[PDB]
Design an enzyme around this catalytic site. Structure first.
Site, PDB file in Angstrom:
ATOM      1  N   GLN A  26      -4.134   6.438  19.042  1.00  0.00           N
ATOM      2  CA  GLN A  26      -4.893   5.825  17.964  1.00  0.00           C
ATOM      3  C   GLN A  26      -5.605   4.597  18.521  1.00  0.00           C
ATOM      4  OE1 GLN A  26      -3.378   6.967  13.781  1.00  0.00           O
ATOM      5  NE2 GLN A  26      -2.650   4.883  14.180  1.00  0.00           N
ATOM      6  N   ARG A  68       3.322   8.926  11.205  1.00  0.00           N
ATOM      7  CA  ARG A  68       2.800   8.622  12.529  1.00  0.00           C
ATOM      8  C   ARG A  68       2.426   9.922  13.223  1.00  0.00           C
ATOM      9  NH1 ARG A  68       5.296   4.270  14.817  1.00  0.00           N
ATOM     10  NH2 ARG A  68       3.417   4.207  16.114  1.00  0.00           N
ATOM     11  N   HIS A 103      -7.523   6.543  10.313  1.00  0.00           N
ATOM     12  CA  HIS A 103      -6.360   5.810   9.813  1.00  0.00           C
ATOM     13  C   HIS A 103      -6.810   4.808   8.759  1.00  0.00           C
ATOM     14  CE1 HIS A 103      -2.549   3.248  10.799  1.00  0.00           C
ATOM     15  NE2 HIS A 103      -2.395   3.983   9.713  1.00  0.00           N
ATOM     16  N   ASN A 142       0.806  -1.216   0.000  1.00  0.00           N
ATOM     17  CA  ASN A 142       0.000   0.000   0.000  1.00  0.00           C
ATOM     18  C   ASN A 142       0.844   1.273   0.000  1.00  0.00           C
ATOM     19  OD1 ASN A 142       0.932  -0.011   2.660  1.00  0.00           O
ATOM     20  ND2 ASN A 142      -1.036  -0.679   3.511  1.00  0.00           N
TER      21      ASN A 142
END
Lengths: 369, 374
Positions: free
Chosen positions: B313, B284, B332, B146
């Protein structure tokens, strides 16, 4: 001379006092070599809001110091408007396609002093050209001033529709997370087939921006691009729009509106599109049958529709494109970023300087003269 | 063998019964020549939702028909959670970075049978590598699956922040028009200076996608890219991040998180940024000090911030990045489009097939095997 300048309203909170940045990137020319506008001087700082009534395209101080009058208004529609009353003795009419002061035959007839009809922007769809010629009215535009601005808007919308950006952002904005809800309608753009219906200044700029996303590029036009351009961009050309649609995952419309293209996207031609196709349309709203697009998004024939052009314009509060599923609409704004405004405000001044000083207006600015 | 697979929840309206499209574009390799995954077979249709609990990465029929056990769950944290209870005798643990099943030293210690820790995605941030080395656990990822997905997300966010897309869209959605309100914070991207803080697979893919927008490209990294890449993209090299920031209209972070990069964007370093700079961060969340970014957007030091990574997260409902001025956040998701899911579900199966059949796992997939030998 009297200059009548139609602009859109200031922001609701008032004309801005501060801006997000202090200057604009330097650009020497447009693709193909046309230079950016060359006025003798400007009375604005590039980056200021120039296309609203308080911005005045930075013109007032140049006009008044040379003995001219400048009337600025947003009241432009109908026989009772401020524009129509001031029109009768105006020498120059200026407006933007984003808030256009229409120069119909009836209005041109009453504009007894009209010598110059200036588009602060691109085009002349709001001007009756034969009436203007018959009355020796010069019609001019700031050619190329926002072609790149529109192309950026197109590629941004293609990416946003394909990757389901706008619902995803809403989940974040409203306090959610909802990963599967975000991505159950989200794909990569990579290796999709993307076609543009014309490849003029905007369409070509779109094609070049799409190429490194490794999509398969298609286009249709009256003029094929040079063979070297087709080769460097690995383009597939199609003789008709109907031949291109069935192969495209994404179709972007960059073609002018005329009766043979009015409602060219309708219930019948949408049948030719791949199921789940995307359409982006920054050209003209009336290229698309309004309700056919909405029906295609309700049924899943289309997986997304985005653009900044509407019929009618401005779009009524209840316009169905505002709320139909998987839309990426904005109001008509793509070519009126602060960047584009700086270019066509400078170009407006350049044309006015030439006009008042009896020097030639650039050939590429002239539409009829 | 027992496979313990952690995935995120189905959509709130239920697992989808139809999809927007019928197939996915064909892609032969990643940039640089690495082939896409090559499992012997797949039991899913590419384009289906594979990363949620009901999707099961398309694994159940392959595992159960070969005598294996498969536990799929989203209940991944706490001593009563399904993941912590099933971990003790699992041979294989699989999860995605988007809903990660943490393999801390303590959990690896309790996983008596653990032989393979498989990232359905890229990386191993959630796995303690030294514990895996000490316990002879293989650690593998679906490399490159990805990287392009994230790069698309980055350029999409750069364009949206610069052109003020998200407030503009809402004026349309809410029944307004308000041209001046849309564009008083809207610019063109053309000829802006854009810098990336690393130029790996994601960062390079971003640079290539940005080039025809006629921006001026900058980058910094531990080492320079090949000169042929610098020349074809007209890159300006900077030896340090601090040297790059002052010249950039846009900065995108594509660098891994380590102690030297934690809070590298803070009230002090933000002073080095051009006024009205834009930051996009898909790396991040903790690279940026949360409240410093919010303060910079209130004051105008930044003209926009967007990304899909948060600290912590999942982001709590009241996380200020959700509503701060001129944000372009998403949850996310960038590397879990349905397209990317097809690749790493296929890659997960390919690795599992090799592992169970005693055949070598691709070198490029390997993070740990006996030792840290990628």
């Amino acid at each position: 001379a009297k200059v009548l300048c139609v602009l859109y309203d200031d922001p609701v909170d008032g004309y801005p006092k501060t801006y997000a940045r202090d200057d604009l990137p330097k650009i020497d020319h447009y693709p193909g070599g046309q230079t950016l506008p060359t006025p003798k001087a400007i009375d604005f700082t590039p980056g200021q809001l120039l296309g609203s009534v308080s911005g005045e395209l930075g013109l007032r101080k140049y006009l008044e110091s040379n003995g001219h009058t400048l009337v600025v208004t947003s009241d432009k529609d109908g026989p009772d408007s401020v524009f129509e009353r001031e029109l009768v003795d105006a020498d120059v009419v200026i407006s933007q396609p984003f808030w256009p002061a229409y120069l119909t035959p009836e209005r041109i007839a009453k504009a007894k002093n009209l010598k110059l009809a200036l588009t602060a922007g691109i085009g002349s769809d709001h001007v009756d050209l034969q009436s203007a010629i018959d009355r020796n009215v010069t019609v001019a535009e700031v050619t190329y001033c926002n072609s790149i601005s529109v192309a950026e808007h197109v590629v941004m919308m293609i990416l946003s529709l394909v990757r389901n950006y706008l619902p995803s952002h809403e989940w974040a904005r409203k306090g959610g997370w909802n990963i599967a809800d975000c991505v159950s309608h989200a794909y990569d753009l990579e290796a999709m087939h993307v076609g543009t219906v014309a490849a003029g200044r905007i369409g070509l700029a779109v094609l070049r921006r799409l190429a490194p996303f490794d999509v398969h590029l298609h286009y249709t036009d009256r003029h094929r691009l040079p063979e070297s351009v087709e080769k460097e961009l690995n383009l597939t050309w199609h003789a008709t729009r109907e031949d291109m649609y069935p192969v495209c995952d994404v179709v972007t419309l960059n073609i002018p509106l005329h009766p043979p293209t009015e409602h060219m996207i309708n219930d019948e031609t949408l049948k030719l599109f791949k199921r789940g196709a995307y359409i982006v349309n920054t050209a003209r709203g009336k290229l698309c049958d309004r309700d056919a697009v909405a029906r295609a998004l309700e049924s899943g024939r289309l997986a997304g529709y985005a653009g900044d052009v509407w019929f009618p314009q401005p779009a009524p509060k209840d316009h169905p494109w505002r709320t139909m599923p998987y839309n990426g609409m904005t109001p008509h704004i793509s070519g009126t970023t602060l960047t584009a405004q700086a270019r066509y405000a400078a170009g407006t001044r350049e044309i006015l300087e030439c006009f008042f000083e009896g020097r030639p207006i650039r050939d590429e600015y002239l539409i009829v003269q």
